[PDB]
Symmetry: C4
Subunit: 146 residues, 4 copies
Amino acid sequence: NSVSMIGKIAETDVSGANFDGNNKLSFSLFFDEKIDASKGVPAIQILNENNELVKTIPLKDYNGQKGYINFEWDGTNEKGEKVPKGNYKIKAEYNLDSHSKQYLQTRIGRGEVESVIFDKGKPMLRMGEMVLPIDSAIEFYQPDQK
Amino acid sequence: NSVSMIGKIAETDVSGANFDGNNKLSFSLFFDEKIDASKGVPAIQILNENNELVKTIPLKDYNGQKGYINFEWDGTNEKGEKVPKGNYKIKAEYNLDSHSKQYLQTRIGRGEVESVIFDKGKPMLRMGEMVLPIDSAIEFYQPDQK
Amino acid sequence: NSVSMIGKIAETDVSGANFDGNNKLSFSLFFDEKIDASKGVPAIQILNENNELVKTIPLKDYNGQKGYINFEWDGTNEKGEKVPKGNYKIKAEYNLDSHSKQYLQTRIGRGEVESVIFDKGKPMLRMGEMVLPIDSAIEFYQPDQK
Amino acid sequence: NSVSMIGKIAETDVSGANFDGNNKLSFSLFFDEKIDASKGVPAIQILNENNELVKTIPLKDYNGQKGYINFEWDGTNEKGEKVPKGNYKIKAEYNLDSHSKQYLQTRIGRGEVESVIFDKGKPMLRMGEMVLPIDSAIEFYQPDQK
């Protein structure tokens, strides 16, 4: 019955993406603030089931963008070799703060709730490309905060 | 208990209208953006239970309007002959996009939720002239999006 | 669980007030628009259980006000004589529209929802002076509309 | 399912804080309007389980601030002596109104709802540093009102 979330930022229990072993993997990250390439080196970190860094994708070419941005991953590691199938965490660091010496942060499975969908009887959140059940959401707050 | 949907755009499972066989049929269509007659030929298409085009109503005279607009249909086809009673789909195309070569779209049974009504204990959505049960709604989002 | 109504206009199934037979009766009416004394003769009509006009209270002295306004009724009719105890409907007409020749309207038991209260476990709506259970509400919409 | 309360001011059944008997006690108070040191003497009152004033913390140094402010209490009384462990109420008075001769008021366990969190399946309100279950909330309203 509640669609009050629409427009709020949502955080979910989905932090990872399944890689089938072969085919490339499209995914969406939400950037609360505008990407500034001059402030640090912004990038995406792709991590395996044991927190091992497997691929790093630089974000510098997306300077000046904000909000949902789509990306692909060929499924290869840093050397260029295909990785084992499985679940992989996808996080990002951007906009090094001059004062605090800290990067702003984001990851797969959080972002602005753009619409609410009822699939059969059940409710579902559209968060860019991702469409998740309501029960997966673990926190809500307004933009430009937290 | 939730009226959070007031002000949101709603999409419902109601896509059609029953024509009794004789009396004219009033109906409401919601226009998200302002009708521009210079951009394509805007019109309403009225379709029977087998997707056969039965009547076309030109929208050019409503240039410059937006939001809910009311319309009538005498129940006649393009030749001027009354059609069988039954259920008829009502869609519209407007504002041909110069770049994409695609029309914006709307139909009966979607639009801004203007109020929420409680019939007996049960809740209902006012969407222009139409008043539908909440359970009929299949998606919600904010205006000027999707 | 839902407080989304706060800030919306609410309409309830409470349309009347009990008069005990003797003591005066305080009550609250909500004025969607600013009272204009030059446009018609604005007033409150007090009606008994059989729709009989019992007292009329002129509103002209409240020109220029809007929103919740409090009033009292001594419990007397137009002649000055105390009326039978019981339930009495309280409506008002104000701001005669020059074009439509129609008065704007309001009554006891509708208005802006100013807060939501949880009394013991149960939820409750503050609507000026009146505090009603949520189940009494029969419609919701935003200000300056309907 | 409802997060409509995000952005609203909340009042809860939590009015006190447990002091363990030794370690200092961090806490948050919400200031609806900007602290004006020139208007009265603004301060926090800390009260024991029998409404006995135990410590007073002056607020004058926080002139010009508004919203959630964090504070600590060493757990000592006005003489400088550690107090018995237990539950202690924490209220504040600020901004003496020239006309009414009354202080504005606040206390621990009310304020703006900044986010909504789901612990396991269950919902929770972030109100500055405090995180409370939804069931603890006893009233909601919009800012700058009540």
